[PDB]
Amino acid sequence: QRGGVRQHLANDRKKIVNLNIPFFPLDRSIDRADIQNFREFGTENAPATVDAEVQRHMARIRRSHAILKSKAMYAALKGTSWSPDDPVSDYNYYDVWGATQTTADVDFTKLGVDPIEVLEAEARAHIIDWAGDNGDNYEIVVLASRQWFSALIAHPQVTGAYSQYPSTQEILRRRLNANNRIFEHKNILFIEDISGNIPAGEAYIFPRGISRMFEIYYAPSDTLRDANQAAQELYVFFKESNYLREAKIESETSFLTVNNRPELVVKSTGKF
Amino acid sequence: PSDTLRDANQAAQELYVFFKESNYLREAKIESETSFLTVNNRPELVVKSTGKFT
Amino acid sequence: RHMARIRRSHAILKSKAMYAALKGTSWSPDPVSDYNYYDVWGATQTTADVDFTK
Amino acid sequence: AKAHVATLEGNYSDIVLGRVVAFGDTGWNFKEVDMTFIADDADADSKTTLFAGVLVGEDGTPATAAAGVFGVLVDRKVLPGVDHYIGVFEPGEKVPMVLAVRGLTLNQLKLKYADGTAIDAAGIQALEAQGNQVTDKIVGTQFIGS
Secondary structure, eight states: OTTSOOOEEOOOEEEEEOOOOOOEEEEEEEOHHHHTTOBOTTSTTSBOOHHHHHHHHHHHHHHHHHHHHHHHHHHHHHTBOOOTTOTTSOOBHHHHTTOOOEEOOEETTOTTSOHHHHHIIIIIHHHHHTSOTTOOSOOOEEEEOHHHHHHHHHSHHHHHHHHTSOOSSTHHHHOOOOOOOEEEETTEEEEEOSSSOSOTTEEEEEOOOOSSSEEEEEOOOSOGGGSSSOOOSOEEEEEEOTTSSOEEEEEEEOEEEEESOGGGOEEEEEEO | OOSSTTSTTTOOOSOEEEEEEOSSSSOEEEEEEOOOOOOOSOTTSOOBOOEEOO | OHHHHHHHHHHHHHHHHHHHHHHTBOOOOOGGGOOBHHHHHTOOOOBOOEETTO | OOOOEEEEEOOSTTTEEEEOOOTTOSOSSEEEEEEEOSOSSSOTTOOOSOOTTBEEOSSSOBOOSSTTOOEEEOOGGGSTTOOOOSSSSOTTOEEEEEEEOSSEEEETTTOBOSSSOBOOHHHHHHHHHTTOEEEOOEEOOSOSOO
């Protein structure tokens, strides 16, 4: 009422946490015996040269680093960091942030119950209730293993829905290049993992969007000239011995992928 | 800094003095505040000297 | 007169703080800021004892 | 593989929602009381049990029922996040403290006794005898959603 006591705003919360970073080296050397007295493979009689071998090895190194980064990116979705063979940076984000995995088990043998209505009731409702405000255009995405997707599509309750979906060429416009299949129904996007990073019979759901949900942190290299200067994506060092008998190639990169909101990822499993 | 909201975590001065008038021409008040610490960084070069007399 | 009194009080407080600091201790006539610089830095106090009787 | 975490909750200006500013001075609302900071038996390691918002008596002993209620502890040395005092005080050491008594607006949701129990009607009318507006019309008591 006009004149009486007013209201107040007296709530807030904060947290702060610290983490380490792993290290990933890679190096190769080239001797005289590798190049001298040989041809270049695809030029018949032209003699071998050091530069071609150096460039090919640089390409191989970059390809390996890219594969490593792609593998590490997936580990964030599962809720754990990626650092094989070193139990010093293997962090479980769910317990780190004091959250727990909401599990939406789906039984594919139950023909009379729609599988993609169990997900709608359990996972998509919660992921939206806990999404939080300020998130603009976050689309729910389902990433599933091949067995889980194949079981889902073959379920009788969804055969009618799938048979009417085009599933022809849209993959080239909804995305840009992967050949994995796509299914979209009831405002949910389904995708099949092709790299085998999803355990067989499991699927995961995340909202996409939501700025600053995933991050990658970088640290300097183990070199004296940049021990505390700054970080870079990938260091490449090329050294040719001062005595003109050997050459060395080294690469360096250290990083950690972070999942800031483990509460917003749902893990699914089912019978077969 | 003084405890006033003007300079919270802002800067420091040796001595703050304020003068107030009620704006109703019936009262005034005087304020003053200070906050400092005197530190001898090297308690090694100060030597006591006690004397027995008579 | 009030300003004069306040200024003189602050001056005498500063002088007393300086004198207390010289001896080797803080000046807070509160426990939150009580310090013994010899203890803080972990040092020892030399004693140039003089016996005027001799 | 611990990931060290630190946290805090609340401020000073959420237990005291507002004041009445006595022009003539600034110490009208408060009273300075002397209490034991570190527990009487615990070593010089224990963060004391004096979270801001506890109700203390007239002689500084922490309250336990509506009878022994005089003021609300709001000293800066016990505000959330102020935790560089651990070894600075010996057991049984006794230090001054600040209580807010008169002409104040108080959050009913923050007031607690020493044990942890929330304030009750008897304590409310006891405090409100000193001229404190104890109010429960607060907005912000539900976080984020979950």
